[PDB]
Assembly symmetry: none
Homo-oligomer: 134 residues x 6
């Protein structure tokens, strides 16, 4: 899957230099592709496995979303697990709730990805994405 920003249409979640961001015209395009697997800490949730680096996962660290090779620890698995919920800014879209910080959601901010509290209308838009099957 790829994931498009709802308020920056044409921009996709991607990994660059092992950090998460959103970008248009993602090059290489595989940087925006993920294998969605049952959540490492909770199978009702999801984890994002990198397509170009198998065994690496999106995960938060100091509340920034980075890409990191799997580590056999509860904290890594919990940092790498996200619950898909109806989109904050549009219930027909999606948002990603952090498993171990349930009041923080994946959002972009100056085009970089964080997990942060969602309080304003701009926060909600920044936290709302479109899932695309490739």
């Amino acid at each position: 899957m790829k994931f498009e920003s709802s308020n920056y249409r044409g921009y996709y979640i991607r990994v660059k230099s092992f950090s998460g961001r959103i970008d248009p015209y993602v090059n290489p395009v595989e940087d925006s592709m993920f294998k969605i697997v049952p959540g490492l800490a909770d199978p009702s949730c999801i984890s994002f496995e990198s397509k170009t680096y198998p065994g690496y996962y999106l995960k938060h660290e100091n509340f920034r979303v980075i890409l990191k090779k799997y580590e056999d620890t509860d904290l890594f698995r919990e940092d790498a697990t996200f619950r898909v919920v109806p989109g904050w800014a549009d219930e027909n879209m999606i948002s990603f709730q952090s498993y171990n910080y349930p009041y923080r959601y994946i959002r972009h901010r100056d085009f970089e990805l964080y997990i942060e509290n969602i309080k304003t209308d701009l926060d909600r838009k920044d936290a709302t994405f479109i899932g695309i099957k490739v």
Copy 2:
């Protein structure tokens, strides 16, 4: 209404993940159904309202044709307004002229929809559709 491609018969304009494309055997079939209303920026034109998502309209953005929730601005309304003209490759069919970019028409290219300049014979066929009432 559904809209069938004239050079890919059996392929229909449809929304997938809030983006416009043409596909055959559209699943679910409602993805290819639209409520045609008077153009949001000009009643002599038309706008394509989603049957699945009322209040969402086909609209161009970065010249890509996408589905987006109605916004109360002139630019959104214009981006969502299209003039039905006689088909570029066949006057018995129709083409869709963009209200705010009059030299650009809805066309498919690698099965995704854009508003682009119609120059060659392939361009004309890619921009020529058949309107089917349902």
Copy 3:
């Protein structure tokens, strides 16, 4: 939510002067109201956040249940995390197992709240409550 004692109907869990007890005719009634949040030490458990004082949680300290402002330590979060299990004195009601003392449960005694081992029939009634949504 509010929580009514099973063996003292009309007595609800409440905070008074930042310590936990059960009282009837709770004045002000907001003292008996809690926001049930994901468990601070484990999201599959619960914590009781004060409605009157956001950011304050019921938690045990020297095995007394008190209300205390959040502190960013593992011990505080574990002291503030409880597992909802079927009621000791009635399986259709509920009891609250301590996260870090798994054989101690919230119970009243002289109308004050403790986490204690649950041994007698009176112990079980003292540890059994009725959840009431508000």
Copy 4:
């Protein structure tokens, strides 16, 4: 591997007199067993090789699914290649998309196997199978 019909539980894909069908209580049971090999026309897909007759493959011909001895042609290899997709009638089961007819899927009809367009709810169930390792 054997493949059980999702709507006719206990009915398995089997070869009878070199023709594909679904049957209960398959005798000999080897007629329902296949070696899943890299797709003859595309190693990222699959082909079904006969366990009873090595070098024979399930392949479609005039849209009927039959068992045929390998032939060294592009058409044969394409007729014998299928893509495993999430099941039409259940995402946790599987369906088999034809490699050279990408909008046709293996389905049973009067207990015989075809590749056909999948339009109705009955079509989707007829096209949905349960893989069973042996």
Copy 5:
């Protein structure tokens, strides 16, 4: 809950490829875990909901016990409803009476699960299970 066979101790009811059976050393072990809910056709009975596949239930079909996604029909709900009774071979254990075939009980036979009439001492043991809370 999981459910252990009384005459094959260490063998548990589990789902494998959407069919019920008993197996030792169940892998993955969640295949043997169920959420016990009020009977879909009668609240005084029980239904077994899959932990692995939420919204899927154990239900009999041609008297075989299978796993199937919930369907909004009386027949499905009745096929998925079972009454817990004292065990046929041991009153301290349990058996499962079919709601709509009241003389048929869940039993294993060649390690596969059916609902069948219980007549012999072997039948009774085959229909007697141990409930284990997990």
Copy 6:
């Protein structure tokens, strides 16, 4: 008699869903009580009869210690007979030697009971108990 673990004091051998384990605060307490009778296969040894379930005995099966209704076979009696010996980790306490597997002793492991070889210092403690008359 009850039998307390030497390395987990306050934890007692008990039967839960007809399987052997050690638990503190055993509930109901009769789950930890046994009638010590002369060994079923050798009256100079002992067998543990259930107080809750007269005629049921602790016995090993697949080297797991379980509770099972008496069976009139030599193998059952052999599986249910144990010899009290000086404790592996404390000669003032006791251990239980399997009668038909004389190098295997009752030990707890992840709080469940097995008959296993006693090799390490952890093994010896896991195999050492305090008998308490009731």
